[PDB]
């Protein structure tokens, strides 16, 4: 085989050069941008190869840890643009630490709980900051962050009675949900609502009436799912759509065949990472939004008794994705990102790591098969494909809330 200190990489094989873009001698803005990214990526790939010597890839854990630890406390005015998304910051940072298996100090856990309590609206749900109106995005984030902390103190912060009333106040006749009072509608709302409602055990028979059908209407000719019916398929909205349907146990409302073919086609033959939609660029966060669809599809098909499903791998190139993330998405100063040349941010740090974890761990029934590229320490903690928080946190939260009644319903 190979000595333990050298590990051959897919992106470094000589045949890989044949995966470069073929523009058929017809240039358009799209091909020009794609070629520019590929050129930069090839340079990056090459820097990890020294002829036959190919050192193991390293996830810079400690650098990422220090970046995250600092952000959980304070941020410069450069973050003013996220003043209405603070619970998101709590979630992205806590989940990244969780994936990196970095314990959350008791004092920090308590402070986060207190802060999220201040973000909770008296009408139910959470806002982007203290005193802000509730919104499904920060609500989704706050609930996930509280579940990651997983203490009864954290669980009890959530006003379940008002949360359910709030969800009702956003529910539309056609099955969709507004993102907030007087707000816009797109599939993100359905996922945020389904996620927090299932985790906190507040789902009623009528809450999601028509929702599955509305989501199905969002799947388009491409096979993926758009923000609203008629719109272009996008990884972000496709994750939201399928994950919400899995929670509702209505995945079969979709054409899983066209969806599977669509998402697998979103992995870039050259870069190894995923693009958000056909003919657009590779981006580290799609390592989760797109690749995360494979574990969901696997479970969906498995429930149908598909005898052709793999018992050891997800239906995407697990190694190639790990190569893209490890070689192209790490900021040497800590944190992860979209692609080489972009600046780090907590959002991409969260999803690049979440995608890396999905790429490293396969699990179906009693079957478990890990593929950890690089040094062994690269292995991250597993993440739940539906909620994107540790599966241990999902079990503990659902178990806790299941012991409580659905607010005013029997």
């Amino acid at each position: 085989s190979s000595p333990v200190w050298s590990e051959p990489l897919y992106s470094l094989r000589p045949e890989h050069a044949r995966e470069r873009l073929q523009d058929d001698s017809v240039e358009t803005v799209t091909s020009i941008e794609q070629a520019k990214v590929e050129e930069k990526i090839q340079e990056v790939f090459s820097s990890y190869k020294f002829n036959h010597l190919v050192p193991r890839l390293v996830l810079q854990r400690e650098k990422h840890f220090h970046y995250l630890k600092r952000g959980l406390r304070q941020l410069t005015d450069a973050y003013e643009c996220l003043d209405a998304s603070r619970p998101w910051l709590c979630y992205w940072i806590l989940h990244s630490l969780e994936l990196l298996d970095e314990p959350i100090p008791q004092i920090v856990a308590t402070d986060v709980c207190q802060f999220l309590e201040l973000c909770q609206s008296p009408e139910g749900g959470f806002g982007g900051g203290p005193g802000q109106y509730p919104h499904l995005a920060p609500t989704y984030a706050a609930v996930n962050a509280l579940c990651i902390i997983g203490t009864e103190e954290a669980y009890d912060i959530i006003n379940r009675e008002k949360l359910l009333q709030y969800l009702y106040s956003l529910k539309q006749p056609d099955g969709s949900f507004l993102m907030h009072v007087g707000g816009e509608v797109d599939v993100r709302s359905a996922y945020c609502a389904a996620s927090v409602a299932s985790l906190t055990n507040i789902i009623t028979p009528d809450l999601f009436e028509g929702t599955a059908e509305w989501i199905a209407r969002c799947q388009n000719w491409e096979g993926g799912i758009g923000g609203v019916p008629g719109m272009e398929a996008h990884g972000g909205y496709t994750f939201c759509g399928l994950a919400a349907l899995v929670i509702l146990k209505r995945e079969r409302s979709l054409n899983l065949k066209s969806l599977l073919q669509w998402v697998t086609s979103r992995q870039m033959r050259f870069e190894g990472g995923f693009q958000g939609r056909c003919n657009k660029l590779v981006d580290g966060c799609y390592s989760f939004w797109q690749a995360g669809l494979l574990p969901l599809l696997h479970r969906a098909l498995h429930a149908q008794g598909d005898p052709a499903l793999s018992m050891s791998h997800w239906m995407f190139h697990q190694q190639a994705l790990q190569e893209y993330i490890l070689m192209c998405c790490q900021c040497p100063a800590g944190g992860l990102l979209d692609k080489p040349g972009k600046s780090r941010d907590f959002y991409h740090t969260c999803y690049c790591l979440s995608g890396l974890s999905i790429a490293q761990h396969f699990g179906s029934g009693a079957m478990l098969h890990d593929v950890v590229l690089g040094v062994p320490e690269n292995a991250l903690q597993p993440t739940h494909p539906v909620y994107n928080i540790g599966p241990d946190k999902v079990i503990q939260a659902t178990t806790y809330f299941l012991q409580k009644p659905v607010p005013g319903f029997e």
């Binding site: 358009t28 799209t30 406390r73 410069t76 005015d77 402070d111 207190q114 816009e184 073919q261 697990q318």
Partner: protein
């Protein structure tokens, strides 16, 4: 009146017309987390925004204040909501607000709140007269802006402005035939106007698409559109397509053409095609070629397809 960057801008805590109201600081608790160290100007505006919001003051001064709050953070949906509450309470001129939102979106086209605000205004006015032209300008700067296309589909469908969209689609495809957002708009327009059941329309679309494929063999969008308009009826229902793609294979053996062939074979086997054994063998051979040579990034997918075919048609 005066902008946040204007040389004569004055902090709200220094404005005499605001002296009667006390600012409301943001309470982040004793031991804050994800605490943003705001600039003096940012905090100043939001301390007063919190004050008017708390007192639910429907005034002209509060209205002007939201404009500054928005410039500081256009993603603050709470400010946007309040502004709309004020637009109604103060009976503000909506055409004036339309000019405002137009400038804002031009500056920040990738923001959910600005597009939603514009949609609400158009809904209140029931006036879409400026929409298609404004959107076209945004798309002229970024031909794939998701929010722009979504807003465009809404306006067209809500106000029935289908008449010239196919021409618009054709123009953008000429500019960049790889623009997947435009191919999506193409399906959107046709499915909602003539539909694809009209065999003359379908033929026109298949010929158009095939022609684009010949021009740019490796453009995935065209291939996806071709499959998209034929998949519901079933790819095996179009016998001539198989032969035509089979004739191009030798000179255009791109993974897209090879994959399309497998898709056709899959459907044929699902419809009791003749010579099942022969079709199955050809499909499995292509799956192996794709998995091992032509489309290795999707090897797991192609191996799955190979196994599915055998579980369904091996007999």
């Amino acid at each position: 009146f005066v902008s946040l960057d204007s040389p004569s801008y004055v902090l709200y805590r220094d404005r005499a017309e605001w002296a009667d109201i006390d600012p409301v600081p943001q309470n982040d608790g004793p031991n804050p987390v994800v605490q943003i160290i705001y600039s003096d100007k940012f905090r100043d505006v939001y301390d007063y925004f919190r004050a008017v919001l708390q007192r639910d003051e429907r005034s002209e001064r509060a209205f002007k204040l939201t404009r500054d709050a928005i410039e500081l953070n256009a993603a603050n949906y709470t400010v946007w909501h309040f502004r709309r509450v004020l637009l109604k309470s103060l009976q503000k001129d909506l055409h004036e607000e339309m000019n405002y939102i137009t400038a804002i979106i031009e500056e920040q086209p990738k923001n959910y709140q600005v597009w939603h605000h514009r949609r609400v205004l158009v809904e209140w006015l029931r006036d879409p007269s400026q929409e298609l032209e404004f959107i076209a300008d945004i798309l002229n700067q970024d031909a794939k802006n998701y929010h722009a296309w979504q807003h465009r589909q809404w306006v067209i469908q809500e106000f029935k402005l289908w008449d010239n969209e196919l021409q618009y689609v054709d123009q953008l495809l000429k500019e960049d035939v790889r623009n997947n957002s435009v191919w999506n708009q193409r399906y959107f327009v046709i499915s909602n106007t003539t539909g694809y059941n009209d065999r003359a329309v379908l033929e026109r679309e298949v010929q158009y698409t095939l022609e684009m494929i010949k021009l740019v063999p490796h453009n995935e969008s065209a291939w996806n559109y071709l499959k998209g308009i034929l998949q519901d009826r079933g790819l095996s229902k179009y016998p001539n397509l198989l032969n035509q793609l089979l004739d191009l294979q030798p000179s255009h053996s791109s993974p897209y053409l090879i994959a399309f062939l497998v898709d056709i074979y899959e459907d044929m086997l699902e419809n009791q095609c003749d010579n099942k054994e022969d079709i199955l063998n050809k499909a499995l051979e292509l799956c192996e070629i794709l998995a091992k040579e032509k489309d290795t990034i999707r090897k797991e997918y192609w191996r799955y397809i190979g196994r599915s075919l055998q579980s369904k048609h091996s007999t």
